[PDB]
């Protein structure tokens, strides 16, 4: 546990603040509740005297002294599909049902826990060398830094927009043209599950091109300039082409008129955003040599795309036999 020793004097305009509130302002490196625990446990002196009432009001000019002490994520046996690894980086093909980094609702079971198990020295790299995210139910490529120099350099490459991250997706609706969504993204004001386009969000740019038309769906490839939470899903939804199977931004599946039983079945069962990180291209953070990796389209999407393709081709003739 780490020994904490801190001194300061309450500023005159802090007159009337609670002891815990005033200490929080003087020492913002330490959480509010932490400071409260320190006070109650007789670890704060005020003018050479122990003061243990967190609610007690300061006057300004009080000399404060604290003498206290302090005290991460666990490795988990979770298999990873490693596409490429060298001394500096790892490229993984992430399956669905796998969160990248611990957060609210997912304390563990994540790619980060998996990395801590596979290569324990990665604990010395910020966020276990994870430099960009994929959603839990998005499949495909991620690059991960194994070392501190590699991580710093990959982060610089992202800031300078020198990493290409391409995805393949199936979107709802007929789309006429490729283009760009450049709309900032924030947390949704009222729906805690959602992100949203919002003037006060973080700037976000997605480029998209049409690979193939289906009857009431469209296959896309996208390239990101930024990697905000849910960026593709929310941008595609914003322009009224939410991703097939998206459980948050999509609505009820709408099959086209006269869709086969197999088409209707495949479409209704598809229970994740039809979204896959398909290609990554970067300058190696150590050698600066240009490199490119591909993750094959997963079977779930292959079946979805083939059914939609057979449907579109069939209904380009008066054929029903
Ligand atoms: Cl994603």
Short mmCIF file of N, CA and C and ligand atoms in Angstrom, two decimals, residues 134-135 138 167 275, ligand 1:
data_model
loop_
_atom_site.label_atom_id
_atom_site.label_comp_id
_atom_site.label_asym_id
_atom_site.label_seq_id
_atom_site.Cartn_x
_atom_site.Cartn_y
_atom_site.Cartn_z
N UNK A 134 -13.27 -2.55 -30.73
CA UNK A 134 -14.37 -3.11 -31.51
C UNK A 134 -15.46 -3.40 -30.49
N UNK A 135 -16.71 -3.25 -30.92
CA UNK A 135 -17.87 -3.59 -30.10
C UNK A 135 -17.89 -5.07 -29.77
N UNK A 138 -19.11 -7.05 -32.76
CA UNK A 138 -18.44 -6.78 -34.01
C UNK A 138 -17.28 -7.78 -34.10
N UNK A 167 -13.92 -1.90 -42.73
CA UNK A 167 -14.95 -2.85 -42.30
C UNK A 167 -15.85 -3.25 -43.47
N UNK A 275 -21.47 -6.53 -39.14
CA UNK A 275 -20.32 -5.56 -39.10
C UNK A 275 -19.05 -6.35 -38.78
CL1 LIG B 1 -16.72 -1.63 -33.98
#
